[PDB]
Ligand binder design. Structure first.
Ligand SMILES: NC(=O)C1=CN([C@@H]2O[C@H](COP(=O)(O)OP(=O)(O)OC[C@H]3O[C@@H](n4cnc5c(N)ncnc54)[C@H](O)[C@@H]3O)[C@@H](O)[C@H]2O)C=CC1
Ligand SMILES: Cc1cc2nc3c(=O)[nH]c(=O)nc-3n(C[C@H](O)[C@H](O)[C@H](O)COP(=O)(O)O)c2cc1C
Ligand code: SF4
Ligand code: FES
Lengths: 85, 430, 213
């Protein structure tokens, strides 16, 4: 999960087309490889507003905590028994 | 008391060990079994737990956990789930063949032990997981349990005490790992014999999810004799925290390989030279002794001279007591070939579940197969030591421990023999 | 020796398997030993019963055990490949199992293994061409003080010499039944030079019983 730790600012993808000579991915978007790293959401929002970039923000999706019980695999009356181990 | 051994026949728990008397019900009642069982049931669970805690009885399976403290884990009121005793009767340990003798020759003693043990823990029934290779022993025990039901000794209103207790016998299907208590529970539950992790202990989540005590045949069958003779009687033998009698299986390179009941802290030399007829070729022909079956490290002749055959004096001899199965190995033994056959046993009997045993026991068997021929170099010895130290305590159950320990004992006592094996390979092949 | 299955014409889900009605009554008696809701605990006995009726386990006994116990068939395949008694190939009528672990190897079990091999003309893992003997090599059979020993289908044969095991194979070929015991002078497990213990009479009921009981 070390790549979920920081906020990232990227841009919308523009057209990549085929090079007629080699089949390479030709682009005309200078910002197609620009990915910026930010520690918090508000730093990225401030950097986008400072540069006049219209932005959209997706909230951080942490996984909600689970309830893990090893003995639940071997219950007496619940469906949560494992059929094998 | 200072000296131990020379146990009398009036103090034996397992009379009719050898099959010389009738194993059935009229034979068992005529030797002391099923006597005043109703009073032992009616004096309560806490009285039986106090008698077992007084006796100093440790777990005869091989680990030696205190049986009273172990059975008192069930001394708690129910939560809707039934409670179970499960008697471990697999006995797949190489060297160990005593529970076969208890089931085959004193079966009603095991039935009364199931009744007393399950009463002490408040259990509903007993599941005697007998090994499947002990088929005649299993049918032997079932004829005994039919005699116990038809005499009203177990079942509905067991011994006229108003306590209901069934005794079930489940055969195994040929897996040594199913002797381990959680893997045995999984084998009873119709699954692969793969050990569960602890916690939960079986006193919390055992067979079918119920509170369950898994206990060996010997630690269950001596419990009516402890409840009749008293706790001080069983604590009168052996050293402190090493109390009682013990069945011993002296096999290997002795003149008369035998099972014999003996006082707990008996010397190893006295036991072999008294009941087994001594080592083949004399005591100076002794090379090594695996004291308690294959899970314990071997000890050489310099340790076997004064060692006592209980738990703590074998811990001090950097081995274990284990199942008290004495495998005797003389000077003519290719000892690396024997330990490599033993590690081969441990890779054929390993359920494949967690990584260190599944990978490292086969990798140790490949290293030991090269060490028998000498097709190695001495820097692989310490390497092998570290491989054992990467299995010891890093596994789910102690089969990884019981496979790391013979390698450690062989290296620790016979590194020069390994080195001269490999250097004579190097001189006659390079 | 494999742990995958391939459909041969003698081992497939169209191989006929069905229990006898006495075996169905035995299966019901097995199922009644376990709590309600844990019928899967009868996988190991009933499947062993499917080995006792048939001698081995095709993949129709496993599916029949999976059908009558209402368990998934993979959960029976796991049991049938985990445990070493379930013959997933048709073995001979007398399945000879020689123990060659260390307490039997110290007492020269290889002599008896080679005696069976040169007596029957097969090696370890093979079957004689008259389909009467399968010789495999097994681990510790729990008869360590009676080393060396073999097992034939239910029966331990203990304290063996090569002459004794040739005698046992000769009376298995002769259509009789051998005596399942130690072929030396002793009876079960005692010291052979006389009883070193349990020579006194057993003390009977009421001996050493503590007061207040
Ligand atoms: N008799 C045989 O055929 C064989 C015996 N053994 C012996 O078995 C031993 C290793 O077996 P294990 O049972 O894995 O080792 P051991 O550490 O776990 O456990 C022995 C008993 O103590 C109980 N126990 C220990 N601490 C407990 C706690 N805190 N709470 C509740 N219960 C507790 C366990 O439930 C178990 O029944 C070795 O000494 C080995 O020599 C090994 C192989 C074969
Ligand atoms: C790999 C392995 C195999 C075991 N096999 C047996 C066995 O066959 N019989 C037995 O009584 N205990 C066996 N044990 C010990 C059990 O875990 C358990 O301690 C014992 O069955 C019951 O506890 P007790 O010592 O208090 O009687 C085995 C342990 C391990 C790790
Ligand atoms: S260490 Fe070996 S015997 Fe134990 S759970 Fe893992 S594979 Fe099984
Ligand atoms: S070693 Fe062969 S029976 Fe235990």
């Amino acid at each position: 999960v070390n790549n979920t730790k920081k906020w990232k600012m990227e841009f919308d993808t523009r057209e990549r087309w085929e090079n007629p000579l080699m089949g390479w991915a030709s682009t005309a978007d200078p910002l197609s490889n620009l990915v910026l790293t930010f520690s918090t959401k508000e730093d990225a929002i401030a950097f986008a507003e400072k540069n006049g970039w219209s932005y959209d923000v997706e909230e951080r999706k942490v996984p909600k905590p689970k309830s893990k019980s090893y003995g639940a695999n071997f219950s007496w009356n619940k469906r949560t028994r494992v059929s094998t181990k | 008391k200072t000296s131990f051994g020379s146990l009398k026949d009036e103090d034996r728990i397992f009379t009719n060990l050898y099959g010389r008397h009738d194993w059935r019900l009229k034979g068992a009642q005529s030797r002391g079994d099923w006597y005043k069982t109703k009073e032992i049931l009616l004096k309560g669970p806490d009285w039986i737990l106090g008698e077992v805690k007084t006796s100093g009885l440790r777990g005869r399976g091989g680990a030696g956990f205190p049986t009273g403290l172990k059975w008192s884990f069930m001394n708690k009121p129910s939560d809707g789930r039934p409670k179970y005793l499960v008697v471990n009767a697999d006995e797949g340990e190489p060297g160990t063949c005593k529970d076969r003798e208890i089931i085959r020759h004193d079966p009603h003693k095991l039935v009364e032990g199931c009744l007393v043990g399950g009463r002490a823990m408040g259990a509903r029934a007993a599941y005697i997981y007998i090994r499947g290779e002990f088929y005649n022993e299993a049918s032997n025990l079932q004829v005994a349990i039919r005699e116990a039901y038809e005499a009203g000794l177990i079942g509905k209103n067991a011994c006229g005490s108003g306590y209901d207790f069934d005794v079930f016998v489940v055969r195994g299907a040929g897996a040594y790992i199913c002797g381990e208590e959680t893997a045995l529970i999984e084998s009873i539950e119709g699954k692969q014999g793969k050990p569960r992790l602890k916690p939960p202990f079986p006193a919390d989540v055992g067979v079918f999810g119920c509170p369950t005590t898994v206990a060996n045949v010997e630690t269950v069958a001596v419990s009516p004799t402890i409840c009749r003779r008293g706790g001080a009687w069983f604590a009168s033998f052996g050293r402190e925290r090493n109390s009682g009698t013990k069945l011993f299986n002296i096999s290997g390179h002795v003149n008369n390989p035998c099972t014999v009941e003996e006082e707990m802290s008996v010397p190893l030399k006295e036991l072999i030279e008294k009941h087994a007829g001594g080592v083949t070729g004399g005591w100076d022909n002794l090379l090594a002794v695996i004291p308690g079956g294959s899970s314990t490290p071997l000890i050489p002749k310099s340790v076997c001279e004064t060692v006592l055959m209980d738990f703590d004096a074998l811990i001090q001899a950097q081995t274990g007591l284990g199942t008290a199965a004495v495998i005797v190995m003389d000077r003519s033994t290719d000892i690396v070939k024997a330990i490599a056959r033993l590690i081969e046993f441990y890779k054929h009997e390993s359920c494949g579940q967690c990584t260190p045993c599944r990978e490292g026991v086969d990798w140790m068997n490949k290293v030991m197969a090269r060490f028998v021929r000498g097709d190695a170099r001495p820097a692989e010895i310490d390497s092998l030591w570290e491989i054992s130290k990467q299995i010891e305590g890093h596994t789910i159950c102690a089969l990884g421990d019981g496979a790391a320990w013979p390698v450690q004992g062989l290296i620790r006592h016979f590194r020069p023999e390994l080195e001269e094996r490999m250097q004579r390979f190097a001189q006659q092949h390079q | 020796a494999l742990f995958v299955h391939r459909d041969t014409p003698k081992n497939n889900p169209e191989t006929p398997f069905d229990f006898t009605p006495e075996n169905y009554k035995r299966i019901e008696a097995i199922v009644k030993n376990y709590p309600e809701g844990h019928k899967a605990a009868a996988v190991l006995p009933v499947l062993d019963l499917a080995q006792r009726q048939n001698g081995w386990l095709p993949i129709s006994a496993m599916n029949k055990v999976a059908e009558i116990l209402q368990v998934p068939p993979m959960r029976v395949y796991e049991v049938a490949t985990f445990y070493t008694m379930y013959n997933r190939k048709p073995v001979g009528k007398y399945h000879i199992q020689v123990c060659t672990t260390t307490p039997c190897m110290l007492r020269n079990s290889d002599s008896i293994l080679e005696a069976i091999q040169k007596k029957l003309g097969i090696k370890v893992g093979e079957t004689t061409p008259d389909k009467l003997f399968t010789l495999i090599e097994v681990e510790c059979l729990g008869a360590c003080v009676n080393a060396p020993m073999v097992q034939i289908n239910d029966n331990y044969y203990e304290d063996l010499t090569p002459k004794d095991i040739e005698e046992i194979i000769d009376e298995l070929k002769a259509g009789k039944i051998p005596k399942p015991g130690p072929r030396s002078g002793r009876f079960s497990c005692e010291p052979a030079g006389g009883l070193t213990s349990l020579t006194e009479p057993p003390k009977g009921p009421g001996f050493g019983v503590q007061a207040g009981l």
